[PDB]
């Protein structure tokens, strides 16, 4: 009844089992020249035999214990799948022989042909899919220990499939979390071309696309990939700059690629291993460690089966009548031949040979096999202890254990809730899945043995909230097996401050160019997509990483030039005040009485007014400061000129009013300009990019020009009268002064436009304040220095009458 090599025992209820005892089938090409024969299997699987023994041990433990299924013995019929759909399908056809016989009406034997109540499912997800398609026809519940494909959660197609292993959605999310944790964004993916690698790679692709992770390459491999595809994938890996490779595959499918990569000696790659090969003895070979060393993988939660190791050590080909795979196990363990290659004596010790069979540190899928067997057993017990009237069937009817059927066991397995030997609650959700934690391991080299050790470096809590599932202790991770520094696996290096991201055409967003910011903008953060513009009166620092205020530039009172000009003007005001004091003190003197005593007082008052008005130009330019800047000096200077002309007006109450009339025109022009186009406070920043120049535009230039021309007119009118008086030195020869006053005014303000009409910053104010001070000082000196010297420094020479 099916394959010759089997492990079967009799009992009241028979449970089927499918384990990979070989890694695959012989690669003999069927040319169909002769009728095809059964294809042999090649490489023994000690781990798979351990899984089979876990199933057998669980069933024997159940039978020994009288508290679970009293007066009912459990049987089994376990076959070898060789990781192939064909072998497992032959075994499954053996399993459903009675169900198919009765459904197909082909009986038109009963004691023989035992009926399988439940099947402990396959390892591979494709194998489990193929088996479940046939098993769901008859509603035989199938509990898998290792198939973690999310495609088996579809209960519309797989009506009777449950599993004691978490499906791969959480594992793909966990790999995405691992990549996000180490700040990687340039990765490549490799997956097996089966129902396991493809959905997991797809889920990882979705998760990583969410987290702004860029996948450089994505290739598919298989156990039967020929030289061309393996070479192509090797070249794809070699060309890629991504160091982190995410692999969703098993051992047998990844073996050819790893062998080729070792042959071509590709090093420096970081491998993110799925659970199927993270603990695989096919790839964790020491000779491959220079390639696959430092692999970060996933491992399920380890379980505790108390008397399991003794059961494993007790296997013997002669004393294992029920287990048929024991003979081949002995032959492959001790490298001999059994007769019912040397001849095995049958007295060897399995502890003297190193194999995965007993040289294990954690039971992960073995505990899953145990849990699946115990789940079926507990469902059967729930059937047995059903109190009538409270059943799960129609009208609360309870099934009979003496005539139980597969669909009733399946119904009870859906509503199953029991506690395992580790105290945890074992329950299948609406999709038949069994959620569980993940462990995180790293591949190291054992210094004492030279083999590969799996060092736990973290875990993955599936019961935590999003973003709190992953914990990694990076201090325990040896990158590439030797290093202690986190590798760089970004497409491009980060852009520093003052630099932005530039697009590389035809490449993902993770690959960019660093472009310096323009001089008008800045960028402070690392890896910024744009340079923020410097706002308001700010400018960019020489490295465009900060904003620096645009310097406001002006003639300050505290500035050295401003200090000098203010002190010089104050000294002039003090000097004219002193001259006034001497004049009033010595008012009773014929020399002063000879000149216009009262009018000279108005002249010197206007002189002091001009000296003070010179201080208007220096300082902070406000609207009021430069509103009365030009016209204050205008009126003061025209008043001084009018006073000088009237004092010299010897050719003529009639003098003070004449001066008032002369200054009335100037005051009228000034007030007309003020009411029409008042000067404003310019804020000129568009002269130097980094400097703000605060000036004061005169509003309408025509009014200022007209005022200046008018002042020149009242200067030239006095100049003509002064010129003719050079031959008449009557009042102590004042012709040499009045001519000199107009001359120095004209010279100072004619020798100053090249200095004036050259600057438009702050020197345009200092130069013109210097011009005002110089003209006023010249006027003061010429008019009053000689007169005050004659009055004071010449007391004896104080002649009563002049010429």
Ligand X SMILES: C[C@@H](NCCCc1cccc(C(F)(F)F)c1)c1cccc2ccccc12
Ligand Y SMILES: *[C@@H]1O[C@H](CO)[C@@H](O[C@@H]2O[C@H](CO)[C@@H](O)[C@H](O)[C@H]2NC(C)=O)[C@H](O)[C@H]1NC(C)=O
Contact 541, 533 (CB under 8 A): no
Residue 438 assigned to a binding site: yes
Q: Count of H helices and E strands in the chain?
A: 25, 25
Question: Which CB sits closer to its own copies, 323 or 408?
Answer: 408
Write the DSSP assignment of 721-756 as a string of letters.
Answer: HHHHGGG---SSS-HHHHHHHHHHHHHHHHSSHHHH
Q: What is the token pair recorded at 802? A: 């002049």
The interface with ligand X within residues 717-776 (CB under 6 A) comprises 749-750, 752-753, 756, 768, 772
Q: What is the token pair recorded at 360? A: 């294990």
User: Cα 459–370–42 angle (5° rounding)?
Assistant: 90
Residue 502 assigned to a binding site: no
Binding residue for ligand Y (CB under 6 A) from 40, 424, 449, 689?
424
Contact 15, 74 (CB under 8 A): yes
Q: How many CB atoms lie within 10 A of CB 554?
A: 17
> Could you give the maximum distance between any two Cα atoms of the chain, in Å?
169
Q: What is the token pair recorded at 407? A: 């669909």
Q: What is the token pair recorded at 20? A: 């990979």
Contact characters 5-34, its own copies, x per CB under 8 A: -------------------------xxxxx
What percent of the chain is helix, strand and coil (3-state, nearest 5)?
A: 45, 15, 40
Check binding of 800 to its own copies (CB under 8 A): no
Give me the least distance between CB of 660 and ligand X, in Å please: 19
Check binding of 494 to ligand Y (CB under 6 A): yes
Binding residue for its own copies (CB under 8 A) from 5, 115, 133, 612?
133
Contact 169, 397 (CB under 8 A): no
Binding residue for ligand Y (CB under 6 A) from 1, 488, 723, 785?
488
Based on its alpha-carbon atoms, the radius of gyration of the chain, rounded to whole angstroms, reads 53
Buried-exposed string 711-736: b where 16+ CB fall within 10 A, e elsewhere = beebbeebbebbeebeeeeebbebbe
The interface with ligand NAG within residues 427-486 (CB under 6 A) comprises 427
Strand partners, 298: 440
Distance CA 282, CA 268 (A): 20
Give me the least distance between CB of 414 and ligand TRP, in Å please: 22
Check binding of 146 to ligand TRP (CB under 6 A): yes
768 binds, among Ca ion, ligand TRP, ligand NAG, none (CB under 5 to 8 A by kind): none
The interface with its own copies within residues 78-117 (CB under 8 A) comprises 85-86, 89-90, 93-94, 97, 100-101, 103-106, 108-109, 112-113
The interface with its own copies within residues 467-526 (CB under 8 A) comprises 501-509, 512-513, 515, 518-521
Residue 212 assigned to a binding site: yes
Question: Which CB sits closer to its own copies, 235 or 507?
Answer: 507
Residue 65 assigned to a binding site: yes
Residue 168 assigned to a binding site: yes
Residue 153 assigned to a binding site: no
Contact 756, 767 (CB under 8 A): yes
Contact 121, 142 (CB under 8 A): yes
The interface with ligand X within residues 424-483 (CB under 6 A) comprises none
Contact characters 653-692, ligand X, x per CB under 6 A: ----------------------------------------
Residue 397 assigned to a binding site: no
Altogether, the residues listed in the chain come to a count of 803
Residue 97 assigned to a binding site: no
Distance CA 193, CA 223 (A): 9
Question: Which CB sits closer to ligand NAG, 212 or 235?
Answer: 235
Distance CA 138, CA 156 (A): 14
Check binding of 437 to ligand Y (CB under 6 A): yes
Contact characters 614-653, ligand X, x per CB under 6 A: ----------------x--xx--x----------------
Question: Which CB sits closer to ligand NAG, 219 or 698?
Answer: 219
Residue 136 assigned to a binding site: no
Check binding of 714 to Ca ion (CB under 5 A): no
149 binds, among ligand NAG, ligand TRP, ligand X, none (CB under 5 to 8 A by kind): ligand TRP
Helix, coil or strand: residue 601: helix
Binding residue for ligand Y (CB under 6 A) from 459, 611, 637, 749?
459
Q: Scanning the structure block, which residue is given the tokens 């000082």? A: 777
Give me the least distance between CB of 168 and ligand Y, in Å please: 17
The interface with ligand NAG within residues 250-279 (CB under 6 A) comprises 265, 267
Give me the least distance between CB of 364 and ligand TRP, in Å please: 8
Give me the least distance between CB of 599 and ligand X, in Å please: 22
Q: What is the token pair recorded at 608? A: 């002091």
Question: Which CB sits closer to ligand Y, 488 or 660?
Answer: 488
Q: What is the token pair recorded at 440? A: 């995180």
Binding residue for ligand NAG (CB under 6 A) from 425, 558, 653, 796?
425
Question: Which CB sits closer to its own copies, 503 or 584?
Answer: 503
Buried-exposed string 229-265: b where 16+ CB fall within 10 A, e elsewhere = bbeebbeebeeeebbbbbbbbbbbbbbbbbbbbbeee
Looking at 347-393, which runs of residues are DSSP E strands?
Answer: none
155 binds, among ligand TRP, Ca ion, ligand NAG, none (CB under 5 to 8 A by kind): none
Residue 192 assigned to a binding site: no
Check binding of 601 to ligand X (CB under 6 A): no
Check binding of 124 to ligand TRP (CB under 6 A): yes
The interface with ligand Y within residues 679-738 (CB under 6 A) comprises none
711 binds, among Ca ion, ligand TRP, ligand X, none (CB under 5 to 8 A by kind): ligand X
Contact 700, 679 (CB under 8 A): no
For CA atoms 612, 614, 620, 625, give the dihedral sign: positive
Name the one range near ligand Y by CB under 6 A: 62-70, 377-385, 486-494, 672-680. Answer: 486-494
Distance CA 631, CA 167 (A): 91
Region of 79 please: left (phi>0), alpha (psi -120 to 50) or beta.
beta
Residue 146 assigned to a binding site: yes
Question: Which CB sits closer to ligand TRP, 272 or 511?
Answer: 272
Contact characters 381-400, ligand X, x per CB under 6 A: --------------------
Check binding of 426 to ligand NAG (CB under 6 A): no
Distance CA 730, CA 732 (A): 6
Question: Which CB sits closer to ligand Y, 158 or 428?
Answer: 428
Distance CA 507, CA 499 (A): 20
In the sheet that holds 116-120, the strands lie side by side as 6-9, 74-80, 13-19, 116-120, 142-144, 161-163
Residue 148 assigned to a binding site: yes
Distance CA 204, CA 202 (A): 5
**In what helix (H) or strand (E) does residue 191 lie, and over which residues does it extend?**
strand 186-192
Residue 623 assigned to a binding site: no
Q: What is the token pair recorded at 182? A: 């180490």
The interface with Ca ion within residues 291-310 (CB under 5 A) comprises none
The interface with Ca ion within residues 206-235 (CB under 5 A) comprises 212
Check binding of 131 to ligand X (CB under 6 A): no
Q: Write out the binding residues for L-tryptophan.
A: 125, 146, 148, 275
The contact set with ligand Y (CB under 6 A) reads: 180, 183, 185, 212, 424, 437, 459, 461, 463, 488, 490, 494
The contact set with ligand NAG (CB under 6 A) reads: 232, 235-236, 239, 265, 267, 290, 417, 425, 427
The contact set with ligand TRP (CB under 6 A) reads: 123-125, 146-149, 196, 250-251, 275-276, 280, 365
The contact set with ligand X (CB under 6 A) reads: 630, 633-634, 637, 707-708, 711-712, 749-750, 752-753, 756, 768, 772
Q: Write out the binding residues for phosphate.
A: 47-51, 364-366
């Amino acid at each position: 009844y099916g394959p010759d090599q089997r492990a079967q025992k009799k009992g009241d209820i028979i449970l089927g089992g499918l384990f990979p005892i070989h890694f695959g089938v012989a690669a003999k090409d069927q040319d169909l020249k002769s009728r095809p024969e059964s294809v042999e299997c090649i490489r023994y699987n000690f781990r798979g035999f351990r899984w089979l023994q876990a199933m057998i041990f669980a069933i024997e433990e159940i039978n020994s214990s009288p508290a679970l299924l009293p007066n009912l013995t459990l049987g089994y019929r376990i076959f070898d799948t060789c990781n192939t759909v064909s072998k497992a399908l032959e075994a499954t056809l053996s399993f459903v022989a009675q169900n198919k016989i009765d459904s197909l009406n082909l009986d038109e034997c009963s004691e023989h042909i035992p009926s399988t109540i439940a099947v402990v499912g396959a390892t591979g997800s494709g194998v489990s899919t193929a088996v479940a398609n046939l098993l769901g026809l008859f509603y035989i519940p199938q509990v898998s220990y290792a198939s973690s494909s999310r495609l088996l959660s579809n209960k519309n197609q797989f009506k009777s499939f449950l599993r004691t292993i978490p499906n791969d959605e959480h594992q793909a999310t966990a790999m995405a979390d691992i990549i996000e944790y180490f700040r990687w964004n340039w990765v490549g993916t490799i997956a097996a071309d089966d129902d396991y690698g493809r959905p997991g790679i797809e889920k990882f692709r979705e998760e990583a696309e969410e987290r702004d992770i860029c996948i450089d390459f994505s290739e598919l491999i298989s156990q039967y990939s020929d030289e061309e595809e393996i070479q192509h994938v090797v070249e794809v890996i070699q060309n890629s700059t991504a160091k982190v490779i995410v692999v969703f595959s098993s051992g047998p499918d990844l073996e050819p690629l790893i062998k080729e990569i070792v042959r071509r000696n590709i090093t420096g790659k970081i491998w993110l291993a799925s659970e199927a090969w993270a603990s695989s003895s096919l790839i964790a070979m020491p000779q491959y460690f220079h390639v696959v060393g430092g692999t970060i993988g996933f491992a399920l939660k380890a379980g505790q089966i108390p008397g399991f190791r003794e059961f494993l050590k007790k296997v013997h080909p002669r004393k294992s009548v029920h287990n048929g795979f024991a003979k081949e196990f002995w032959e492959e363990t001790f490298n001999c031949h059994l007769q019912e290659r040397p001849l095995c004596t049958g007295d060897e010790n399995i502890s003297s040979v190193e194999t995965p069979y007993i040289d294990y540190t954690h039971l992960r899928i073995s505990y899953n096999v145990y849990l699946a067997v115990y789940s079926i057993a507990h469902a059967l017990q729930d059937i047995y202890t059903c109190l009538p009237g409270r059943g799960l069937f129609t009208n609360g009817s309870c099934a009979d254990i003496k005539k139980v059927e597969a669909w009733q066991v399946l119904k009870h397995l859906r509503h199953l809730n029991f506690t395992n030997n580790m105290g945890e609650q074992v329950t299948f959700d609406e999709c038949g899945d069994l959620v569980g934690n993940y462990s995180i391991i790293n591949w190291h080299l054992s210094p004492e043995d030279g083999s590969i050790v799996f060092k736990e470096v973290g875990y993955y809590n599936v019961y935590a909230k999003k973003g709190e599932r992953l914990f990694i202790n990076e201090e325990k991770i040896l990158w590439s097996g030797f290093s202690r520094e986190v590798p760089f696996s970004n497409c491009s290096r980060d852009c520093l401050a003052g630099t932005r991201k530039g697009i590389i055409e035809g490449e993902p967003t993770c690959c960019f160019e660093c472009v310096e910011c323009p001089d008008g903008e800045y960028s402070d953060e690392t890896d910024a997509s744009a340079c923020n513009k410097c706002p308001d009166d700010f400018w960019s620092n020489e490295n465009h990483t900060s904003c620096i205020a645009k310097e406001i530039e002006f003639l300050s009172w505290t500035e050295p030039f401003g200090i000098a000009l203010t002190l010089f003007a104050v000294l002039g005001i003090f000097l004219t005040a002193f001259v006034l004091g001497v004049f009033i003190k010595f008012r009773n003197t014929p020399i002063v009485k000879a000149t216009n005593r009262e009018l000279s007082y108005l002249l010197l008052f206007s002189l002091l007014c001009c000296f003070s008005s010179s201080l208007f130009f220096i300082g902070e330019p406000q609207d009021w400061t430069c509103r009365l800047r030009q016209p204050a000096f205008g009126i003061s200077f025209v008043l001084c000129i009018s006073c000088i002309l009237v004092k010299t007006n010897r050719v003529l109450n009639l003098q003070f009013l004449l001066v008032f009339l002369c200054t009335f025109m100037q005051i009228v022009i000034c007030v007309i300009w003020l009411y029409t186009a008042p000067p404003s406070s310019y804020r000129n920043q568009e002269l130097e990019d980094e400097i703000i120049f605060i000036t004061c535009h005169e509003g309408s230039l025509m009014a200022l020009g007209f005022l200046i021309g008018y002042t020149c007119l009242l200067a030239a009118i006095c100049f003509f009268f002064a010129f003719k008086s050079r031959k008449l030195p009557e009042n102590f020869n004042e012709a040499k002064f009045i001519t000199f006053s107009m001359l120095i005014f004209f010279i100072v303000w004619i020798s100053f436009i090249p200095a004036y009409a050259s600057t438009y910053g702050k020197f345009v104010s200092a130069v013109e304040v210097i011009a005002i001070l110089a003209a006023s000082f010249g006027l003061l000196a010429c008019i009053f220095f000689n007169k005050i010297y004659i009055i004071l420094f010449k007391p004896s020479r104080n002649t009563i009458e002049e010429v």
